[PDB]
Design a protein around this ligand. Structure first.
Ligand SMILES: [Mg+2]
Ligand SMILES: [Mg+2]
Ligand SMILES: [Mg+2]
Ligand SMILES: [Mg+2]
Ligand SMILES: [Mg+2]
Ligand SMILES: [Mg+2]
Ligand SMILES: [Mg+2]
Ligand SMILES: [Mg+2]
Ligand SMILES: [Mg+2]
Ligand SMILES: [Mg+2]
Ligand SMILES: [Mg+2]
Ligand SMILES: [Mg+2]
Ligand SMILES: [Mg+2]
Ligand SMILES: [Mg+2]
Ligand SMILES: [Mg+2]
Ligand SMILES: [Mg+2]
Ligand SMILES: [Mg+2]
Ligand SMILES: [Mg+2]
Ligand SMILES: [Mg+2]
Ligand SMILES: [Mg+2]
Ligand SMILES: [Mg+2]
Ligand SMILES: [Mg+2]
Ligand SMILES: [Mg+2]
Ligand SMILES: [Mg+2]
Ligand SMILES: [Mg+2]
Ligand SMILES: [Mg+2]
Ligand SMILES: [Mg+2]
Ligand SMILES: [Mg+2]
Ligand SMILES: [Mg+2]
Ligand SMILES: [Mg+2]
Ligand SMILES: [Mg+2]
Ligand SMILES: [Mg+2]
Ligand SMILES: [Mg+2]
Ligand SMILES: [Mg+2]
Ligand SMILES: [Mg+2]
Ligand SMILES: [Mg+2]
Ligand SMILES: [Mg+2]
Ligand SMILES: [Mg+2]
Ligand SMILES: [Mg+2]
Ligand SMILES: [Zn+2]
Lengths: 122, 134, 52, 158, 50, 135, 86, 59
RNA sequence: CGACUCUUAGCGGUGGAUCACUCGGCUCGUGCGUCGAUGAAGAACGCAGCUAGCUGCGAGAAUUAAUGUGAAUUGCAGGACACAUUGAUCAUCGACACUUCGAACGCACUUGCGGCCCCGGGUUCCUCCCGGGGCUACGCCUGUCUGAGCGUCGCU
RNA sequence: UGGAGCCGCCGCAGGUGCAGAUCUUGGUGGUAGUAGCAAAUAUUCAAACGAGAACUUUGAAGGCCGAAGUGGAGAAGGGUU
RNA sequence: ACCCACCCGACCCGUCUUGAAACACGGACCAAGGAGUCUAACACGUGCGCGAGUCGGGGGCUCGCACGAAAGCCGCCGUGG
RNA sequence: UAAGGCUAAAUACCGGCACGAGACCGAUAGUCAACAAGUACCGUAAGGGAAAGUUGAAAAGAACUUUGAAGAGAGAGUUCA
RNA sequence: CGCGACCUCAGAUCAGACGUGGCGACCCGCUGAAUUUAAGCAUAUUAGUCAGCGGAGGAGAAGAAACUAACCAGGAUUCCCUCAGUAACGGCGAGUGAACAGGGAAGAGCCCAGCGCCGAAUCCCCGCCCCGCGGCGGGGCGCGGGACAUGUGGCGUACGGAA
């Protein structure tokens, strides 16, 4: 009875859509049965069927977005969705290499007058 | 005393901590001791109590030497219901009386894979502690 | 208010005097006993012990 | 309304002073925080003097202080020049260097020179790699001390 | 008014849905302090956010 | 200058504060210019400004602005201080050359006000009861 | 006449529901609010009404992005990784 | 039917057609004082309403 | 004695003081010190088998995935599950998702009108019609293309 | 009576003692079964239902509003009435 | 100390006021709340420590503070007051 | 040595996140707010803005008989009460 | 009557970037009262204070002397103690009111324009390859564009610097 993410991961895309459709259909019949008395046995299912639909849809959106960022991993400009969302301000930090840079003058200083390790009293 | 300066010792905070504890923490709180028979065997003082352990009630009205199976663990009420620990309501129907796990002693554990491993870990840390003391 | 003068300061010498007095009267079995300490069977009142 | 003899006194509590009262319940935690920070820096700058760099002997201005002598800010350039220490390098061996100090009297100069001389003598320059080149001291004067100097380096006593 | 906007209708609808009294099974819950809804509104007296 | 923005005269209060005409703004006109150029170009960052001319009714200024995000500025290490976010809106906070002048901070005896960070900081320090633990 | 009778002819309304702040304070004729200042970009707040300020600061509402920003930060703002699987 | 409030008559018509392999004459929506869009759906004369009702569950 | 009234006590009412509790405050201190066009704060409307409020969440709506945990959840139902199995329940939260207003962005705030590209029914590009998708704010920077000027020149 | 904490002595500390403030908050009296339930003509008889009818309903009679209506429909406002 | 009797005495408190039982004001009744505080500065008195000195801050050195945001110490002991 | 520029550190912090403590308050106190509180409610609106904690160890929350239309009782029972 | 340079200006749903609002204890920039005190009041005071507007950061601002001093001289800023309720201001009334030195907390110093030398020796964007890719970077290779002589880069900045 149970639909787990476990197995859905591997499955083909058309197969997932068929399962999703099938769960949505089952949901509809349960919703009708809620209106017409139905049964407590049926009015559990409605929660179970809702969460199963979510599992399928979740797995689909996982697969789709993972494939997308496989496609862009390499390209310079990539969709804002797939760009790393840290924090507005943190995305205008300096570049990690651009911080790195020393001016030629500064490099010359570090070369010529480096900080020495030393002690006193001997 | 307690020295660690990130713990609390503060009635209100430890009381809040208790009554607003989440299921998985309440598992730990609702532990109970093992019998002196099992203590000897496993090298473990106490275990989180569980749906179908066999159990003796130690203190209260139902204080007795009868070994009842646990029926259910009501972690919201911090209590466990036990096989024959029950009282007749006005209209004849029986009602499972709540016993707080700490006033109960486990005679027979329900050994699954996980429980086994917990017992193995606890006994190990005990033996490390005894070796350190020696 | 917070800025009530909570802390109170004392002359150094006076503190040192105080602590001499307090030491002095940890001898004197009478005063120790009157402070409630059951010092009936103790062998010698400035009670000094080995340094093991 | 004043009453029969006293100091005709003017307290300055006419502004909204209670809005700007600065209590001192920090101070303990502050002192601790400072001392922790201080202990960290000592650990970072491993065998260096915790103190900081060596600083110049200096007379106080004005007829009042005049007779006393302090630590100054840094060694003047004329003083370094006489000692034979390149001004850019002095900063890398732990010698303070200001370049705003004039140097009027010869008496102040020579004493400060003597200071840098003394410092250079009793300083243990570690080599850049563990494999030793010139300048860097012997492995004897190295094992016997990679020690810090607690308190101010070569202290001034008036 | 019988010439409502949609925004207004949707707002009146919500208030209508909120009015209903407490379901009696609530009162049997473990940690229950609620006996009656006390946010009930009677059209004749007390007159909407409007 | 700066005529006092009140209806008719009617600066209601004690006649110290009756003035409306002969009174003058704190910041300079060059500093106003920088500020308006900064306002307009919010992405851009105000560096500094210079004078170019003045009629009776106008002054003119030329306000140097920088992209904090054009790679030529960013990768240059001598300029990439402006790309840091403390230097947002220097002109607004009174930090450009012309804006700094009105703050009235320099070293020495001709200052003393502004002998903390700024005019406001000194007043703060001077009018705090430091109420010590022990007193 | 000034009183009771003239409470009679309060037939028509000044304000309606403001669409930014939700309050019933949007003035139809002026087409502003008077609570947030809707059409104006910046939210209206005055320092004289502290209580009015506290009636809608950040903490007030859901904080639905902001609450998960605090958690994200706590553990380190990490992205695009998972914990070690089974 | 109770329908999602965002629906057009055109969308409802297409939906019903898809779900119940039916065909519609006309859709005739209203919005309940409640918030649920009701939609009376006139089925074309070739089909009966009672038969489809039994098919879907209601009667 | 009679009724009534007054006083005192007993019991009973009314009322909720006192006392005893305290998952709340107030104050002092420590560490960190993080929001937003990648759509914030705030507002709205929704979402539960029975649920109004609070809380929690967003049409995957009392949550999905994952990881840790290891049998519950529990007001009643109903169920699942083999709790020798990715496995109940909690916690964590790194993946995914996140209705409508809102700086709020096609133009308007009726929830009204739109343009332009692509896709499915509709056609068999016949434009219509319907449905779906993606664009369509202002300001400004670097470049790009198209341009304007009896602005300053050159060659013809 | 009540059902879980509390006191003596020596020191320290205070948001430390109420009859009043037309004091603040809560409660209760006498007044008092009092004033009162008097604008716009009007009610009566029977039956039914019902534990119970001056007041509900049905029937009968007598009355009023008297088409500038106490009639029939809307606007605004209400918001499920 | 509960009630009752009798003889003698006996005006209602609070308050401002030269003068209140007042035809002066506040006060139906009961409960709980409710007003000389804290900081700074001076002065004089008193107690204690040291005495031509005295002093402690501010800082520093000693601990993760259980009690400690204490306690102790400092050519800083005296820059300085 | 002005009329150009950058720069950590000791410093601030009644907002935030997360902790710790107290000679504080103990439900008319302490935050407006110990509770479904910026809630109900009021005001056109700016804005104002409450009250409200405690059965018991455990619901064992009074089956059943009987009077009454019922609310209410009388027995019976639960509980150490 | 064209075609072509540049100069100044337009238009783009052109390619790729950024800004917009919030919070607001602390911080920077403006603006700025009046209750109040003076036993009246107008200068003063309250106070550069509340309210108002703007802009930030984890801190901000300040900061490497057009400084103090007048000494046998000190030597960026900030903070604490002290200077000091002092010098000074003031219907010299009410009231207000700093700084230097001294002792500490900390301690860190630097870069341009210019003047000059060096075939612009510099920068940005395209496009192809190898690595690296959840803070778009390195290396290589392109008669591939542009920026730039109305001045980019290296040396160099008063402590002197260059040759
Ligand atoms: Mg250079
Ligand atoms: Mg130091
Ligand atoms: Mg009405
Ligand atoms: Mg004045
Ligand atoms: Mg000037
Ligand atoms: Mg009890
Ligand atoms: Mg107290
Ligand atoms: Mg009283
Ligand atoms: Mg009567
Ligand atoms: Mg008539
Ligand atoms: Mg009608
Ligand atoms: Mg009518
Ligand atoms: Mg009297
Ligand atoms: Mg009289
Ligand atoms: Mg009077
Ligand atoms: Mg009276
Ligand atoms: Mg009292
Ligand atoms: Mg004295
Ligand atoms: Mg600066
Ligand atoms: Mg209460
Ligand atoms: Mg109460
Ligand atoms: Mg309260
Ligand atoms: Mg009470
Ligand atoms: Mg109460
Ligand atoms: Mg009670
Ligand atoms: Mg009570
Ligand atoms: Mg009892
Ligand atoms: Mg902003
Ligand atoms: Mg006056
Ligand atoms: Mg007066
Ligand atoms: Mg006056
Ligand atoms: Mg002033
Ligand atoms: Mg202000
Ligand atoms: Mg800064
Ligand atoms: Mg400068
Ligand atoms: Mg100075
Ligand atoms: Mg003095
Ligand atoms: Mg002043
Ligand atoms: Mg050059
Ligand atoms: Zn609004």
């Amino acid at each position: 009875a149970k639909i787990k993410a476990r197995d859905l991961r591997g499955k083909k895309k058309e197969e997932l859509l068929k399962q999703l459709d099938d769960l949505k259909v089952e949901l509809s019949q349960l919703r009708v049965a809620k209106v017409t008395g139905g049964a407590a046995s049926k009015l559990s299912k409605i929660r179970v069927v809702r969460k199963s639909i979510a599992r399928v849809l979740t797995v689909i959106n996982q697969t789709q977005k993972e494939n997308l960022r496989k496609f862009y991993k390499g390209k310079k400009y990539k969709p804002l969705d797939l760009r790393p969302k840290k924090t507005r301000a943190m995305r205008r930090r300096l570049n990690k290499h651009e911080e790195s840079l020393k001016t030629k003058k500064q490099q010359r200083k570090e070369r010529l007058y480096p900080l020495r390790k030393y002690a006193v009293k001997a | 005393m307690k020295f660690n300066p990130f713990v609390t010792s503060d009635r209100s905070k430890n009381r809040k901590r208790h009554f607003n504890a989440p299921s998985h923490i309440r598992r730990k709180i609702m532990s109970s001791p093992l019998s002196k028979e099992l203590r000897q065997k496993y090298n473990v003082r106490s275990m989180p109590i569980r749906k179908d352990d066999e159990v003796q009630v130690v203190r209260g009205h139902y204080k007795g030497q009868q070994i009842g199976k646990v029926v259910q663990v009501y972690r919201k009420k911090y209590v466990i219901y036990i096989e024959r620990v029950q009282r007749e309501k006005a209209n004849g129907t029986t009602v499972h009386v709540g016993i707080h796990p700490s006033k109960v002693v486990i005679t027979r554990l329900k050994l699954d894979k996980d429980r086994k491993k917990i017992l193995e870990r606890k006994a190990k840390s005990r033996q490390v502690g005894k070796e350190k003391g020696k | 208010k917070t800025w009530r003068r909570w802390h109170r300061r004392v002359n150094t010498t006076q503190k040192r005097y105080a602590i001499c007095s307090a030491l002095a009267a940890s001898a004197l079995p009478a005063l120790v006993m009157s402070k409630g300490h059951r010092i009936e069977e103790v062998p010698e009142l400035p009670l000094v012990v080995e340094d093991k | 309304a004043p009453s029969r003899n006293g100091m005709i006194l003017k307290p300055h509590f006419h502004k909204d002073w209670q809005r700007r009262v600065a209590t001192w319940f920090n101070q303990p935690a502050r002192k601790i925080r400072r001392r922790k920070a201080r202990q960290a820096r000592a650990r970072r700058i491993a065998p260096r003097p915790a103190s900081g760099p060596l600083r110049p002997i200096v007379r106080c201005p004005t007829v009042r202080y005049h007779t006393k002598v302090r630590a100054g800010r840094g060694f003047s350039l004329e003083e370094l020049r006489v000692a034979g220490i390149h001004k850019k390098v002095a900063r890398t061996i732990g010698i303070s260097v200001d370049p705003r100090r004039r140097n009027k009297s010869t008496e102040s100069l020579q004493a400060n020179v003597q200071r840098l001389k003394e410092y250079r003598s009793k300083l243990v320059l570690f080599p850049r790699k563990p494999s030793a080149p010139k300048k860097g001291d012997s492995s004897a004067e190295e094992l016997k001390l990679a020690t810090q100097l607690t308190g101010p380096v070569m202290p001034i006593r008036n | 008014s019988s010439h409502k906007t949609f925004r207004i209708k949707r707002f009146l609808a919500k208030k209508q849905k909120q009015n209903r009294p407490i379901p009696q099974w609530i009162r049997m819950k473990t940690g229950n302090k609620i006996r009656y809804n006390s946010k009930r509104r009677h059209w004749r007296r007390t007159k909407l956010g409007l | 200058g700066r005529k006092r923005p009140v209806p008719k005269g009617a600066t209601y209060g004690k006649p110290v504060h009756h003035g409306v005409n002969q009174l003058k703004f704190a910041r300079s006109l060059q500093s106003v210019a920088e500020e308006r150029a900064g306002r307009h170009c919010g992405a851009l960052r105000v560096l500094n400004s210079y004078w170019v001319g003045e009629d009776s009714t106008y002054k003119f200024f030329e306000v140097i602005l920088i992209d904090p995000f054009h790679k030529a500025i960013r990768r240059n290490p001598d300029t990439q201080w402006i790309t840091k976010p403390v230097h947002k809106h220097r002109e607004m906070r009174g930090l450009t050359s012309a804006g700094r002048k009105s703050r009235g901070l320099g070293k020495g005896h001709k200052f003393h006000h502004t002998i903390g960070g700024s005019r406001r900081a000194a007043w703060r320090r001077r009018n705090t009861l430091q109420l010590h633990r022990y007193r | 006449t000034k009183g009771t009778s003239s409470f009679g002819k309060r037939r028509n309304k000044t304000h309606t529901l403001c669409r930014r702040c939700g309050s019933k304070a949007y003035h139809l004729q002026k087409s502003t609010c008077g609570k947030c200042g809707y059409p104006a970009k910046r939210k209206r707040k005055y320092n004289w009404s502290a209580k009015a300020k506290r009636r809608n600061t950040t903490g007030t509402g859901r904080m639905r992005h902001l609450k998960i920003v605090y958690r994200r930060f706590r553990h380190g703002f990490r992205e695009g990784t998972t914990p070690k699987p089974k | 039917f109770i329908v999602d409030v965002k629906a057009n008559k055109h969308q409802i018509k297409q939906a019903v057609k898809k779900l119940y392999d039916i065909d519609v004459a006309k859709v005739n929506t209203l919005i309940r004082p409640d918030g649920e869009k009701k939609a009376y759906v006139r089925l074309a004369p070739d089909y009966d309403a009672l038969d489809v009702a039994n098919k879907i569950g209601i009667i």
